[PDB]
Amino acid sequence: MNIFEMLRIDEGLRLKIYKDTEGYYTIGIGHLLTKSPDLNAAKSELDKAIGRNCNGVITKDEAEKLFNQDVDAAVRGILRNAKLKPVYDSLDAVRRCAAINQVFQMGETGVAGFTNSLRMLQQKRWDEAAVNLAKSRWYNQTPDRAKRVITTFRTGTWDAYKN
Numbered sequence: 001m002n003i004f005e006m007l008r009i010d011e012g013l014r015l016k017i018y019k020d021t022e023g024y025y026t027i028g029i030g031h032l033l034t035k036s037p038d039l040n041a042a043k044s045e046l047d048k049a050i051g052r053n054c055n056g057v058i059t060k061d062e063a064e065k066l067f068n069q070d071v072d073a074a075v076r077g078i079l080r081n082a083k084l085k086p087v088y089d090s091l092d093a094v095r096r097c098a099a100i101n102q103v104f105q106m107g108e109t110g111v112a113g114f115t116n117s118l119r120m121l122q123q124k125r126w127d128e129a130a131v132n133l134a135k136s137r138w139y140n141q142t143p144d145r146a147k148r149v150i151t152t153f154r155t156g157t158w159d160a161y162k163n
């Protein structure tokens with residue numbers, strides 16, 4: 001297991017524009033296109049992202065390219081964030097993957113609301129952090145994914161995914 005395999009499980013792979021859990025146009029491996037309800041705006045974002053006229057469909061290679069870019073940008077964003085970098089750098093490699101996964105799903109506006117959880121993670125109070133992480137809109141809206149990510153934060157193992 002690694003961050004790519006983990007996010008591939010959590011995000012799936014779809015080659016046509018679909019709506020994500022929040023109702024937003026998305027493609028590939030959780031590549032958000034737009035929060036606009038206009039499918040035409042989503043198609044324009046897709047074409048811009050891929051560099052050709054896609055008419056709402058991409059190939060697996062193209063999906064994996066966006067995924068590579070999105071994971072890299074997620075990690076780099078963490079390192080550029082003053083609140084997130086010290087917490088991230090305090091973690092072991094497996095728990096770092098849980099952090100990347102969260103940021104990938106929620107963005108940095110989303111994790112902004114996880115400050116208290118962040119402190120507990122930096123303190124390595126794993127069970128307490130796990131309890132706090134579940135007291136969230138995130139958990140309530142995507143509980144089976146959040147449970148996997150939280151187990152990863154709690155244990156520093158891949159137990160929630162290896163199966």
Ligand SMILES: c1cc2c([nH]1)CCCC2
Nearest residue numbers: 078084087088099102111
């Ligand atoms: C839990 C810890 C961290 C996150 N979740 C997201 C950004 C990096 C630090």
